[PDB]
Design a protein around this ligand. Structure first.
Ligand SMILES: *[C@@H]1O[C@H](CO)[C@@H](O[C@@H]2O[C@H](CO)[C@@H](O[C@@H]3O[C@H](CO)[C@@H](O)[C@H](O)[C@@H]3O)[C@H](O)[C@H]2NC(C)=O)[C@H](O)[C@H]1NC(C)=O
Ligand SMILES: *[C@@H]1O[C@H](CO)[C@@H](O[C@@H]2O[C@H](CO)[C@@H](O)[C@H](O)[C@H]2NC(C)=O)[C@H](O)[C@H]1NC(C)=O
Lengths: 35, 337
């Protein structure tokens, strides 16, 4: 079967820079429709 | 580098705590912003009040002196404080000082060269005004995002140390808004929900799937020296995965990631905001004395009369088809003992 990535459940998101391992932002989306 | 792994370490401990608080809720905060503000504050601390913060930040003093650490922060602010063409990065530090107070020179100078802090004499006497002033500097620096940082202001507040970070970037492979549509988003094992799902097809992106942790790692790069790593744990794995959030398990993700063609990818289009009062979180992380009457902040003025009252933190994060906007601010409320 096709490799399918579907984010239909609470996921973690880590915005980090290329130029070094340091975490800029980091969120855990438990429910998108907050706003 | 090495002291970059500290910063990562401090991010995951802070996260682990924030979740203990309200696991059920979403999270969003910038770790870098917090670390810079308490490193900045640390510039004015001495003795134990100093050891603590410098240890609550996950630094290994056994191998690092306080000068090396402060230097780390200047090089880093220097390096990343620059918006490319397709990626905007902005970092700012400022110190709002009440008019009456004369602060040590060593402190005002170190603030300048090291953290690039801007000073502002303030009248913390008339709370109303002092407030707005700080809020403009933040919203100004965050291009209209952080708008309610400081909401109340002690008339006893001698000083405030602020930090903001703004991030605007685009996707290397952006979504087609024409293809964006509603789909189910599972809040839990059975409770589903309708949500605008953004979808892409036939992309070759850095993927990875490690079973020893039961989750999947996908990587989407922004047109810039920055990229977003989405971690997707399986149903009932979230707990286990947060348990393993360590500087090392991160190091692994980023090594094991190998390009691959994915047939279909689905990512919600979200926008989230969060306020935070970090006093209790800091206390758990061992940053205690600075909050106590045993506050040794003599590095600022020249006497043990200042102490920390509050450290709040606001962050916003929009994830849309075209790209990402993100932003946060940290402000330290410094009161007279
Ligand atoms: C840096 O912090 C240390 C730790 O608090 C300070 O050392 C402490 O200073 C106090 C006040 O001089 C000492 O007081 C004495 O304590 C002993 C019992 O420990 C008692 O028998 C005496 O009658 C008096 O109360 C305390 O011992 C001392 N402890 C340590 C571990 O050093 C130090 O003064 C601070 N230095 C700076 C530069 O801020
Ligand atoms: C990071 O970059 C920003 C933008 O250049 C810096 O902000 C400027 O700082 C100078 C003083 O060094 C002020 O006089 C300018 O008015 C600020 N820019 C704007 C657009 O207002 C910031 O100081 C730099 N460094 C750090 C550590 O924040």
């Amino acid at each position: 079967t096709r490799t399918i990535v579907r984010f239909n459940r609470p996921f973690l998101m880590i915005i980090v820079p290329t130029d070094t391992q340091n975490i800029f932002f980091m969120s855990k989306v438990t429910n998108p429709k907050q706003a | 580098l090495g002291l970059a792994s500290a910063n990562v370490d401090f991010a995951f401990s802070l996260y682990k705590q924030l979740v203990l608080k309200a696991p059920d809720k979403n999270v969003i905060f910038s770790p870098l912003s917090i670390s810079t503000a308490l490193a900045f504050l640390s510039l004015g601390a001495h003795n134990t009040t100093l050891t603590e913060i410098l240890k609550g930040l996950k630094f290994n003093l056994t191998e690092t002196s306080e000068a090396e650490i402060h230097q780390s922060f200047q090089h880093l602010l220097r390096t990343l404080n620059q918006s490319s063409d397709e990626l905007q990065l902005s970092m700012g530090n400022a110190m709002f000082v009440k008019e009456q107070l004369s602060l040590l020179d060593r402190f005002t100078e170190d603030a300048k060269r090291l953290y690039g802090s801007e000073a502002f004499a303030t009248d913390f006497q008339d709370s109303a005004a002092a407030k707005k002033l700080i809020n403009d500097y933040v919203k100004n620096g965050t291009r209209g995002k952080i708008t309610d940082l400081i909401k109340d202001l002690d008339s006893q507040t001698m000083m405030v140390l602020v930090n903001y970070i703004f991030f605007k970037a685009k996707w290397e492979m952006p979504f087609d808004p024409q293809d964006t549509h509603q789909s189910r988003f599972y809040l839990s094992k059975k409770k589903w929900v309708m949500v605008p799902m953004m979808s892409l097809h036939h992309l070759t992106i850095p993927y990875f799937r490690d079973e020893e942790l039961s989750c999947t790692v996908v990587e989407l790069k922004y047109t810039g020296n920055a990229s977003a790593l989405f971690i997707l744990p399986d149903q009932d794995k979230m707990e286990e995965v947060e348990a393993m959030l360590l500087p090392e398990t991160l190091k692994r993700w980023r090594d094991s990631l190998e390009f691959r063609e994915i047939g279909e990818l689905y990512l919600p289009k979200f926008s989230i905001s969060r306020d935070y009062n970090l006093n209790d979180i800091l206390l758990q992380l061992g940053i205690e004395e600075a909050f106590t009457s045993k506050a040794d902040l003599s590095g600022i003025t020249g006497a043990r009369n200042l102490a920390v009252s509050q450290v709040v933190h606001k962050a916003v994060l929009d994830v849309f088809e075209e790209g990402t906007e993100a932003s946060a601010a940290t402000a330290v409320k410094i009161t007279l003992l």
